[PDB]
Amino acid sequence: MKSVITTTISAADAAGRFPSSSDLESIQGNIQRASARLEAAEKLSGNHEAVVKEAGDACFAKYSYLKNSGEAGDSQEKINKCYRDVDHYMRLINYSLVVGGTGPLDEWGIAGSREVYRTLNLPGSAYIASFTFTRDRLCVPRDMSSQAGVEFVAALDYVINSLS
Amino acid sequence: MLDAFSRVVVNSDSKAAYVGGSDLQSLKTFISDGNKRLDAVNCIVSNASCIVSDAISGMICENPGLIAPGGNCYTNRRMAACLRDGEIILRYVSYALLAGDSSVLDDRCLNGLKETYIALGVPTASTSRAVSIMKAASTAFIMNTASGRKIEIAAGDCQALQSEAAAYFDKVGSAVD
Amino acid sequence: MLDAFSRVVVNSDSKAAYVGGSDLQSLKTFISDGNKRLDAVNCIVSNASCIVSDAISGMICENPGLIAPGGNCYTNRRMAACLRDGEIILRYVSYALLAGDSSVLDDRCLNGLKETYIALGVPTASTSRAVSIMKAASTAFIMNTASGRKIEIAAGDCQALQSEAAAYFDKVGSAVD
Amino acid sequence: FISDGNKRLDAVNCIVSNASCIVSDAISGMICENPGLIAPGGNCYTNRRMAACLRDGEIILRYVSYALLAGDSSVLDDRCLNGLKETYIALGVPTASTSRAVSIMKAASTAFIMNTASGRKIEIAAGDCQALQSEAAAYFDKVGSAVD
Amino acid sequence: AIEFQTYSGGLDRVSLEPYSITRYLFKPAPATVTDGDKDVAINAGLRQLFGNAYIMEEERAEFYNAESKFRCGEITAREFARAVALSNAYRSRFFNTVSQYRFFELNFKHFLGRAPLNQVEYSKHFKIFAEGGYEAEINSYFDDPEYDEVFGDDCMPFTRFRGTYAPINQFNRMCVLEGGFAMSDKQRPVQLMTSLAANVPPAAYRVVDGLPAIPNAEHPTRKFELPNASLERFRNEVEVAKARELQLRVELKEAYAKRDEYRSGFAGFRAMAADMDISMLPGPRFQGRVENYPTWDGKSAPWGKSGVDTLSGVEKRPAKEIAKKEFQLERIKQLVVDLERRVAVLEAEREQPALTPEPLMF
Amino acid sequence: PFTVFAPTNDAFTDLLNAHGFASFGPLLRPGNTDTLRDVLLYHVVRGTYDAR
Amino acid sequence: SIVTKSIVNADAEARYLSPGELERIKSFVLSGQRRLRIAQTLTENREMIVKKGGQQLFQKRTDVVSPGGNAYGEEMTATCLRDLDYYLRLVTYGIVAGDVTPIEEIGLVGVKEMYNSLGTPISGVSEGVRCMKDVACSLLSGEDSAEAGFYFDYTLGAMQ
Amino acid sequence: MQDAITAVINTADVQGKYLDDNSLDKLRGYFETGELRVRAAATIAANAATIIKESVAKALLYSDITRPGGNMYTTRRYAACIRDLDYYLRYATYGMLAGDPSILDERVLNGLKETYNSLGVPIGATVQAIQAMKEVTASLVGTNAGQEMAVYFDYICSGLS
Numbered sequence A: 001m002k003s004v005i006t007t008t009i010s011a012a013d014a015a016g017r018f019p020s021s022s023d024l025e026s027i028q029g030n031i032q033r034a035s036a037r038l039e040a041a042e043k044l045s046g047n048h049e050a051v052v053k054e055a056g057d058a059c060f061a062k063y064s065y066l067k068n069s070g071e072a073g074d075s076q077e078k079i080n081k082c083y084r085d086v087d088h089y090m091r092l093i094n095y096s097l098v099v100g101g102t103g104p105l106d107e108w109g110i111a112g113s114r115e116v117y118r119t120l121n122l123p124g125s126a127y128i129a130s131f132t133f134t135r136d137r138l139c140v141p142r143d144m145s146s147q148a149g150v151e152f153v154a155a156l157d158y159v160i161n162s163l164s
Numbered sequence B, C: 001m002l003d004a005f006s007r008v009v010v011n012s013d014s015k016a017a018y019v020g021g022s023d024l025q026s027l028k029t030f031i032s033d034g035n036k037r038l039d040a041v042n043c044i045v046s047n048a049s050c051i052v053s054d055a056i057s058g059m060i061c062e063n064p065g066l067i068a069p070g071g072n073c074y075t076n077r078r079m080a081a082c083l084r085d086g087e088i089i090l091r092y093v094s095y096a097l098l099a100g101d102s103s104v105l106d107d108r109c110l111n112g113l114k115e116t117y118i119a120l121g122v123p124t125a126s127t128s129r130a131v132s133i134m135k136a137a138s139t140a141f142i143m144n145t146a147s148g149r150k151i152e153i154a155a156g157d158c159q160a161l162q163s164e165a166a167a168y169f170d171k172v173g174s175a176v177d
Numbered sequence D: 001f002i003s004d005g006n007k008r009l010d011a012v013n014c015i016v017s018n019a020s021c022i023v024s025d026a027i028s029g030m031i032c033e034n035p036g037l038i039a040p041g042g043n044c045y046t047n048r049r050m051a052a053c054l055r056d057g058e059i060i061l062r063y064v065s066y067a068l069l070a071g072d073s074s075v076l077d078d079r080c081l082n083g084l085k086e087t088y089i090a091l092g093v094p095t096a097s098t099s100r101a102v103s104i105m106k107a108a109s110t111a112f113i114m115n116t117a118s119g120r121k122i123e124i125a126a127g128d129c130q131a132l133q134s135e136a137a138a139y140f141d142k143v144g145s146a147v148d
Numbered sequence E: 001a002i003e004f005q006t007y008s009g010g011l012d013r014v015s016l017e018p019y020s021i022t023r024y025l026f027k028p029a030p031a032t033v034t035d036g037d038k039d040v041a042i043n044a045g046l047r048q049l050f051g052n053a054y055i056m057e058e059e060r061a062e063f064y065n066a067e068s069k070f071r072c073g074e075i076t077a078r079e080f081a082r083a084v085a086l087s088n089a090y091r092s093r094f095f096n097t098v099s100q101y102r103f104f105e106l107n108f109k110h111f112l113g114r115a116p117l118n119q120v121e122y123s124k125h126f127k128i129f130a131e132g133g134y135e136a137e138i139n140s141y142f143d144d145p146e147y148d149e150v151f152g153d154d155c156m157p158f159t160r161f162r163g164t165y166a167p168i169n170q171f172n173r174m175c176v177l178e179g180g181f182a183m184s185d186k187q188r189p190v191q192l193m194t195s196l197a198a199n200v201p202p203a204a205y206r207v208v209d210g211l212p213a214i215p216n217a218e219h220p221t222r223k224f225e226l227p228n229a230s231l232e233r234f235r236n237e238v239e240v241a242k243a244r245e246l247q248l249r250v251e252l253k254e255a256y257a258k259r260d261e262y263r264s265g266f267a268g269f270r271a272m273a274a275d276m277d278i279s280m281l282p283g284p285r286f287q288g289r290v291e292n293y294p295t296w297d298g299k300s301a302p303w304g305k306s307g308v309d310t311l312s313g314v315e316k317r318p319a320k321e322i323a324k325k326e327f328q329l330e331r332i333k334q335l336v337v338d339l340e341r342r343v344a345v346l347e348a349e350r351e352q353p354a355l356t357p358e359p360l361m362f
Numbered sequence F: 001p002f003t004v005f006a007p008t009n010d011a012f013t014d015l016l017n018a019h020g021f022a023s024f025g026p027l028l029r030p031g032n033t034d035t036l037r038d039v040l041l042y043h044v045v046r047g048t049y050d051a052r
Numbered sequence G: 001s002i003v004t005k006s007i008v009n010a011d012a013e014a015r016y017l018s019p020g021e022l023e024r025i026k027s028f029v030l031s032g033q034r035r036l037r038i039a040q041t042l043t044e045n046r047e048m049i050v051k052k053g054g055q056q057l058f059q060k061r062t063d064v065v066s067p068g069g070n071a072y073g074e075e076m077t078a079t080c081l082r083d084l085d086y087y088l089r090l091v092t093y094g095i096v097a098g099d100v101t102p103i104e105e106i107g108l109v110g111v112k113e114m115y116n117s118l119g120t121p122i123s124g125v126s127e128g129v130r131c132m133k134d135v136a137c138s139l140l141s142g143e144d145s146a147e148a149g150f151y152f153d154y155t156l157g158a159m160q
Numbered sequence H: 001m002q003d004a005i006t007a008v009i010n011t012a013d014v015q016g017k018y019l020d021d022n023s024l025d026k027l028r029g030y031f032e033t034g035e036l037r038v039r040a041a042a043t044i045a046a047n048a049a050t051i052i053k054e055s056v057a058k059a060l061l062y063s064d065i066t067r068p069g070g071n072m073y074t075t076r077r078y079a080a081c082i083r084d085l086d087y088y089l090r091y092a093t094y095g096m097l098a099g100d101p102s103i104l105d106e107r108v109l110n111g112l113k114e115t116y117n118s119l120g121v122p123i124g125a126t127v128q129a130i131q132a133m134k135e136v137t138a139s140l141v142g143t144n145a146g147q148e149m150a151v152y153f154d155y156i157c158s159g160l161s
């Protein structure tokens, strides 16, 4: 996975050197930023269900055309498949959030997504309506800590800026 | 290559469920541990050359067949290849110390080694002996009980970590055989 | 890569004799057929991507294991590689339709594919299911009896060519297993 | 066996569809071995006793062949060999004669299993089968040691 | 040569898009000479231009002449790799001590990044060497158009992981031809020549010796978890794994048989289901944020972990029957590979026992 | 009430005759279970039909 | 079957069959070929009854095929029409039997426990069987659909 | 029947001895796990119907059994089937909350193998239904309590097999 310590040890391995103080300071910043984004990880594992539910409900609240038959979504199965897709995305935000960096998220979710989504008539604007709904429904002090919330923001925005 | 984090993440992805608190709790300690691992890696990577010299020298000392003609360490070139192989082994072990998981060691160094030495006729028992000597030397530096060099650190308990390092070298010594 | 012409020529070379009239007469039946095969390849290559989408989606529908975390289809990367593999399979089949002989298909895909998917862990029965659905969908397009798209073509008989195309997909589905 | 399969089954089919050949072969060669074991007072002299002799040849080859499917002759040991020599002693049956007939059955079996027997040339693709031949001779000298 | 050359050679020669999909992600990177003070492309370039073979300083002095120009930046990456190939070190490691067949195959391995395609290219390079010699053959290597399409002039040659592999045996032969990450190219026989003449898949276990490692596989490669034993024990475990695979294959044939038996019976009712006019409570029209799950309670996550999880029908449930047996069959198909790997490794140990002379000469 | 017309263990040994090994020979192939079901269902008869 | 019921009752009383019951069996075995005509017609027209009865069911009752409902989706609707096919078939068994004992023991004894274990509203099942009764009465004569329709009425009385 | 307490008083009674420190260690073990067993029994009491519904949906429906010819094909036999799953869940809860499977020996496994082998109830399907209840129940009560219920459902499965 792309992460702190895998970038540094991958660089030291490609370079063929002993691990000097640079990699040590990198993992120092990993272990110092850690507490915040792990708190965000805890709360994401807390309420993921309602996240996915409001995400998809606001997604079809914006795009009502999908429900009409012949569209991407029209079968108990299709809308079910919408929720499953969103749920996978939030779980990968939780995994990349715990790891740190974009390595876990990028290789599972983003790599090769263009072929799939372009193939299967899947509009990205529905996903982005879901994620920007979650990012607007976020909060500053009430549910989370502000600093960790910034981390959450970053990861969600990354998904948006890898989608369209 | 997956580190502590990626190990937890992979396990949770195969389980297809969010990592949650349990996995986050074990992770917190890894994070809460921290600088012990940092200073450990600094100790082994500091005196790394010297570890490799002493271990390979000891390994030639126990059975002098290596430097005997027809042995695999007889040539100056072969002695140099010997030294750089021990160095690289120690290098990957230090990578696995910063990682917390042996996935770097499994993928980058363990993947194709036994076959290589079998193809070149390198005696595997001798290699496991040299891995063992680097294990003892590395644990001696990592506990700061080294008889030559004893540097000041803020004191405490670092036994766990020593058990981890011993596990890495046992992985390599089990692999080469 | 040998078409029907080169197959007749190679068979005449095996016996080291001139092709003669008989084989030329059958060749006149092949060439006199002609634009039936042209319009057939135009039909399958027209609706190709939609064949691949429907077939792979149906293949995921018959065994849910691929969808769940575990199977290759789960995640975007693997789903993309699955779609391009169905596309490449259909591509080589259409090559065998223009050719008239399966030579292009046998060497390029049939000879070393099963070992490759065994080395990657791809489930072969799922692949044969996908090749079967591409077969039924391709024969339904080739007979112009598809339930969603029916374009006007001057009528005639194209059953034997449908049998040929079904034989190529049975060759691929027999090969992948 | 997953490697053997059609080859081991092929061998068993070679020995089985030559059964009357091997039995009547070895028993007729057993009679043409010694003229004292066809003459009056011989076990085989009585018409009934000859019939049970042919039946015993068929039973030996049947359980031997069966073992060839069953890998080890546990099937053979439980019924076919269990209580043999005690019976052949308790009925006055000669044992050297039976040991000779089992040896002739063994030689005909290996010559059928390697197609070196001139006269039957069933068409199989060639292979190595020496191990399996040694299992066949292994079973016949298990029984051939048990008759004596 | 002058014979029609089949295939497309290397596709990646247009449209670099399929590097995203394949195993190319879990390679480290290519070393691209972009800014000044290079220091990296020299290292990875010497890593791949040789076979991970250990080079000392006394033997880097042989091509330091070519290293100087390139550290200055006067020559390109292509001309530097070419000047490395013309040097005596590459002759001594690969040309002078190795037979020719392996030498040509290693020229394909290092230079173009791929295995040979056919007998056609292979005999073509036999003619190139027979008519022009060593230098002319290396010039034929670096002066390919395929090189200038893919590797350019600023990237060092890397092992190529395109999406298609128009011969699939090109993929099998390049994964066989490359070793592991920690696998040096010395004392090794001709790997590919048996697969080149009269095209065969090389092996089942050997291909995955060459692949870059995937983090999340659905079956862990059970290397270093196999217990220690003699050869015939492992061959017996091979025979057990094969028999169990046969049982699982027959079981899957039963599974597909039953599924088609139910589905062909139920498809009539599926046609009546497509016949109906069936309208939703608010389905025809109405824009009011309708509830997609009015039977959720507080914890259900009804959609499920796979989408088709919660759903079950007459034909959906036998799919759930099939997927389990598929998974176990894939487990044991991954077992056979590692067993044959262990038998091949221990057999290679049997051929060449490691011997050290016991007494020193003093 | 089932009557099972049941052959002994020595009866299956009787199957070795070239004729019998030809007929029931391919049942030793591993896939053939429904054929064994047909044979063994041919041996079982409902109701009770014994001697007198 | 009526004959079976009569025999069982006689067996319980441990007597021969009465005059009356034998008279009834006579009337039954003389009414036989008319019954076999009825079940012949409901046999060979089953797809119209299941399809058209399912259409009238889902058009009268848009609950269960709505999202949220028990029968929502193609597979669930196909299972719904599969059960209407079951009941239609049993009704044919009850017509040739001349008694609802096949209908009762194959389909009705413990039906409410099953559909309550499936989450299915059984009143929708009874509305479905009533819809198939209307179609099956549209396919028959006057007295004929009186008889067969009354077998359907028995099934309705068991569902409600 | 007997719980863990009664079983300790049985062994200590049948030796004639009083309660020594080992038997008090066993009663301390049961009295530590007491509350966990209580809340597990509460949850299973709450969701019995949903346990049987989800377990029948996993294990038994849309297969040969509810297809005609199978043993669940009619509504009479469906209702008897889900009746029996009810009994297995209820007595498995008693066995969990007693801490001793003697109730399963006395009031369930007695005569039931003779019964099912008499009528033609398939044992395999029954065992798979009980294991489906084991997975669903463990999903409701959690890990520890799911292990406890797991030993009692496995006890019934070991009884019928």
Ligand SMILES: *[C@H](C)[C@H]1/C(=C/C2=NC(=C\c3[nH]c(C[C@H]4NC(=O)C(C=C)=C4C)c(C)c3CCC(=O)O)/C(CCC(=O)O)=C2C)NC(=O)[C@@H]1C
Residues within 6 Å of the ligand: B056, B066, B071, B072, B073, B077, B078, B079, B080, B081, B082, B083, B085, B086, B088, B108, B109, B113, B116, B120, B121, B122, B123, B126, B127, B130, E051, E052, E053, E054, E055, E181, E182, E183, E184, E185, E186
């Ligand atoms: C020293 C204690 C040994 C000794 C080592 C030798 N290794 C030789 C060659 C060689 N070794 C490897 C594996 C190594 N290279 C790597 O880069 C990595 C991991 C990243 C490993 C595990 C390879 C691939 C090669 C071939 C390329 C090369 O020559 O460097 C070697 C040369 C001759 C030989 O094959 O033995 C030596 C001497 N050999 C000894 O006998 C002592 C005990």
Ligand SMILES: *[C@H](C)[C@H]1/C(=C/c2[nH]c(/C=C3N=C(/C=C4\NC(=O)C(CC)=C4C)C(C)=C\3CCC(=O)O)c(CCC(=O)O)c2C)NC(=O)[C@@H]1C
Residues within 6 Å of the ligand: H065, H071, H072, H077, H078, H080, H081, H082, H084, H085, H087, H088, H107, H108, H109, H112, H115, H119, H121, H122, H125, H126, H127, H129
């Ligand atoms: C359901 C998961 C499986 C199944 C069950 C099935 N059971 C029966 C009939 C009976 N079952 C019992 C069971 C019990 N009696 C007890 O005292 C206890 C312990 C408390 C148990 C578990 C009894 C007595 C009967 C018969 C009479 C009666 O219930 O009152 C049937 C009926 C079969 C028939 O032909 O009659 C069925 C179908 N069926 C399956 O396929 C599942 C595996």
Ligand SMILES: C=CC1=C(C)[C@@H](Cc2[nH]c(/C=C3N=C(/C=C4\NC(=O)[C@H](C)[C@H]4CC)C(C)=C\3CCC(=O)O)c(CCC(=O)O)c2C)NC1=O
Residues within 6 Å of the ligand: A059, A066, A072, A073, A074, A077, A078, A079, A081, A082, A083, A084, A085, A086, A088, A089, A108, A109, A116, A120, A122, A123, A126, A127, C057, C060, C067, C073, C074, C075, C076, C079, E307
């Ligand atoms: C690891 C991450 C990961 C994802 C993110 C998903 C992404 C994804 N979704 C689908 C597939 C699908 N995804 C949806 C979802 C949609 N329905 C709509 O109405 C909306 C537009 C949208 C929800 C917001 C649908 C309906 C399908 C099925 C499409 C079809 O078959 O027509 C597929 C193809 C395989 C399949 O059918 O399941 C994939 C790869 N899968 C993964 O493995």
Ligand SMILES: C=CC1=C(C)[C@@H](Cc2[nH]c(/C=C3N=C(/C=C4\NC(=O)[C@H](C)[C@H]4CC)C(C)=C\3CCC(=O)O)c(CCC(=O)O)c2C)NC1=O
Residues within 6 Å of the ligand: A043, A044, A045, A046, A047, A048, A050, A051, A054, A134, A137, A138, A139, A140, A141, A142, A143
């Ligand atoms: C794990 C991620 C995660 C989220 C992203 C949130 C998202 C979220 N917020 C609310 C719910 C809410 N969120 C807020 C937050 C606020 N509203 C305001 O007007 C303020 C500006 C802002 C605080 C800064 C409020 C006030 C509610 C309750 C009422 C509402 O919907 O606004 C709800 C409904 C349940 C509830 O009432 O708690 C959900 C799912 N919850 C999560 O668990």
Ligand SMILES: C=CC1=C(C)[C@@H](Cc2[nH]c(/C=C3N=C(/C=C4\NC(=O)[C@H](C)[C@H]4CC)C(C)=C\3CCC(=O)O)c(CCC(=O)O)c2C)NC1=O
Residues within 6 Å of the ligand: A021, A024, A025, A028, B034, B035, B036, B038, B039, B040, B042, B043, B142, B143, B144, B153, B154, B155, B156, B157, B158
């Ligand atoms: C970039 C390089 C770099 C390093 C080399 C370390 C060095 C280092 N170690 C510690 C901190 C520490 N280091 C150790 C380690 C020791 N335990 C013992 O038994 C031994 C004497 C010794 C290992 C050989 C311990 C125990 C602490 C915590 C001390 C304490 O809190 O009491 C700290 C203070 C911050 C912290 O608590 O983590 C620092 C800066 N950190 C870095 O950033």
Ligand SMILES: C=CC1=C(C)[C@@H](Cc2[nH]c(/C=C3N=C(/C=C4\NC(=O)[C@H](C)[C@H]4CC)C(C)=C\3CCC(=O)O)c(CCC(=O)O)c2C)NC1=O
Residues within 6 Å of the ligand: C033, C034, C035, C036, C038, C039, C040, C042, C043, C141, C142, C143, C144, C153, C154, C155, C156, C157, C158
């Ligand atoms: C360069 C592109 C190119 C094409 C795409 C074809 C298109 C094409 N097809 C036909 C001609 C034909 N095409 C078909 C094909 C059909 N048979 C059926 O059952 C199906 C409806 C359909 C295949 C899917 C038939 C049967 C004829 C002969 C029609 C006739 O003579 O009645 C003709 C007239 C000349 C001829 O008889 O060959 C042409 C131009 N030709 C070309 O040069």
Ligand SMILES: C=CC1=C(C)[C@@H](Cc2[nH]c(/C=C3N=C(/C=C4\NC(=O)[C@H](C)[C@H]4CC)C(C)=C\3CCC(=O)O)c(CCC(=O)O)c2C)NC1=O
Residues within 6 Å of the ligand: D003, D004, D005, D006, D007, D008, D009, D010, D011, D013, D014, D113, D114, D115, D124, D125, D126, D127, D128, D129, F025, F026, F029
């Ligand atoms: C049901 C009955 C039944 C049989 C009788 C066998 C028949 C049989 N034998 C082989 C196949 C074979 N059979 C033999 C046998 C031998 N070859 C020799 O040269 C020796 C004379 C002889 C020693 C026994 C060999 C060597 C092969 C090919 C190697 C192999 O398949 O293992 C095959 C493989 C398929 C094929 O060749 O077409 C089959 C089906 N299998 C069965 O299922």
Ligand SMILES: C=CC1=C(C)[C@@H](Cc2[nH]c(/C=C3N=C(/C=C4\NC(=O)[C@H](C)[C@H]4CC)C(C)=C\3CCC(=O)O)c(CCC(=O)O)c2C)NC1=O
Residues within 6 Å of the ligand: D043, D044, D049, D050, D052, D053, D054, D056, D057, D059, D060, D079, D080, D087, D091, D093, D094, D095, D097, D098, D101
């Ligand atoms: C299951 C395995 C099995 C066997 C292996 C046989 C072994 C066997 N043979 C005989 C019996 C016999 N066996 C023979 C055979 C012989 N005739 C000779 O000339 C030779 C010495 C020898 C053949 C090589 C004869 C002749 C008898 C009858 C002996 C007599 O009545 O005098 C009997 C006594 C019952 C009978 O009369 O049939 C038995 C148990 N029976 C079995 O059930």
Ligand SMILES: C=CC1=C(C)[C@@H](Cc2[nH]c(/C=C3N=C(/C=C4\NC(=O)[C@H](C)[C@H]4CC)C(C)=C\3CCC(=O)O)c(CCC(=O)O)c2C)NC1=O
Residues within 6 Å of the ligand: E064, E065, E066, E067, E068, E069, E070, E071, E072, E073
């Ligand atoms: C094949 C023939 C061949 C040569 C003749 C050299 C020529 C040469 N020298 C340098 C490079 C150099 N050459 C020198 C040498 C000098 N130091 C001084 O004090 C003196 C003026 C002078 C020795 C008499 C130095 C110092 C550099 C490095 C310059 C720098 O980096 O500042 C470079 C650039 C690449 C590099 O840094 O090595 C080249 C091409 N290289 C070749 O390949």
Ligand SMILES: C=CC1=C(C)[C@@H](Cc2[nH]c(/C=C3N=C(/C=C4\NC(=O)[C@H](C)[C@H]4CC)C(C)=C\3CCC(=O)O)c(CCC(=O)O)c2C)NC1=O
Residues within 6 Å of the ligand: C066, C071, C072, C073, C074, C077, C078, C079, C081, C082, C085, C088, C089, C108, C109, C113, C116, C120, C121, C122, C123, C126, C127, C130, E021, E022, E023, E162, E163, E164, E165, E166, E167, E168, E171, E214
């Ligand atoms: C010229 C012909 C030709 C082919 C036929 C393909 C065959 C092929 N597929 C893959 C590779 C792949 N193929 C699949 C496909 C699968 N996904 C599944 O769920 C199913 C089991 C299966 C579709 C039915 C997947 C998922 C990968 C990527 C595997 C991975 O990286 O884990 C690779 C390795 C390179 C790559 O990653 O793309 C190759 C050579 N390529 C070619 O060049």
Ligand SMILES: CCC1=C(C)/C(=C/C2=NC(=C\c3[nH]c(/C=C4\NC(=O)[C@H](C)[C@H]4CC)c(C)c3CCC(=O)O)/C(CCC(=O)O)=C2C)NC1=O
Residues within 6 Å of the ligand: E312, G064, G065, G070, G071, G076, G077, G079, G080, G081, G083, G084, G086, G087, G090, G106, G107, G118, G120, G121, G123, G124, G125, G128, H061, H062, H063, H066, H067, H072, H073, H074, H075, H078
């Ligand atoms: C011969 C006597 C007999 C009957 C009748 C019978 C019915 C029966 N109906 C079932 C399901 C079902 N039946 C229905 C029926 C309906 N849904 C509605 O909304 C409507 C009111 C109604 C259709 C008219 C549905 C939706 C299911 C599946 C529900 C689910 O699985 O979630 C099942 C579950 C498994 C399976 O079908 O294979 C059985 C066994 N079984 C029998 O042996």
Ligand SMILES: CCC1=C(C)[C@@H](CC2=N/C(=C\c3[nH]c(C[C@@H]4NC(=O)C(C)=C4CC)c(C)c3CCC(=O)O)C(CCC(=O)O)=C2C)NC1=O
Residues within 6 Å of the ligand: B050, B051, B054, B055, B057, B058, B061, B062, B132, B133, B136, B137, B140, B141, B145, B146, B147, B148, B149
């Ligand atoms: C005669 C042939 C010969 C050798 C050569 C040595 C080699 C040697 N060093 C060891 C082990 C060893 N070696 C060192 C490193 C070393 N010690 C220091 O204090 C400094 C400054 C060092 C580098 C200069 C340490 C620190 C240890 C651990 C033991 C200790 O605490 O000293 C061990 C023990 C291995 C084990 O525990 O399994 C051996 C065999 N032994 C021999 O028989």
Ligand SMILES: CCC1=C(C)[C@@H](CC2=N/C(=C\c3[nH]c(C[C@@H]4NC(=O)C(C)=C4CC)c(C)c3CCC(=O)O)C(CCC(=O)O)=C2C)NC1=O
Residues within 6 Å of the ligand: C050, C051, C054, C055, C057, C058, C059, C061, C062, C132, C133, C136, C137, C140, C141, C145, C146, C147, C148, C149
């Ligand atoms: C619920 C999981 C599921 C699926 C997914 C489908 C998949 C599917 N498509 C088929 C077959 C099939 N599919 C298509 C292609 C398809 N139809 C069109 O008209 C257009 C425009 C298409 C692409 C968008 C055609 C043309 C056929 C041939 C039948 C026909 O005439 O429609 C067949 C029949 C296979 C055979 O004949 O052996 C199946 C199983 N079925 C399932 O059960």
Ligand SMILES: CCC1=C(C)[C@@H](CC2=N/C(=C\c3[nH]c(C[C@@H]4NC(=O)C(C)=C4CC)c(C)c3CCC(=O)O)C(CCC(=O)O)=C2C)NC1=O
Residues within 6 Å of the ligand: D021, D022, D025, D028, D029, D032, D103, D104, D107, D108, D109, D111, D112, D116, D117, D118, D119, D120
């Ligand atoms: C004159 C009194 C007399 C006999 C009677 C024979 C009997 C006889 N057959 C033998 C052996 C023998 N017999 C057969 C069977 C036989 N051959 C066939 O090819 C067919 C179709 C057969 C049945 C019709 C085979 C197959 C062998 C093995 C030798 C061979 O390869 O032919 C052997 C060798 C025994 C041994 O190896 O120890 C003998 C003694 N010999 C005699 O001296």
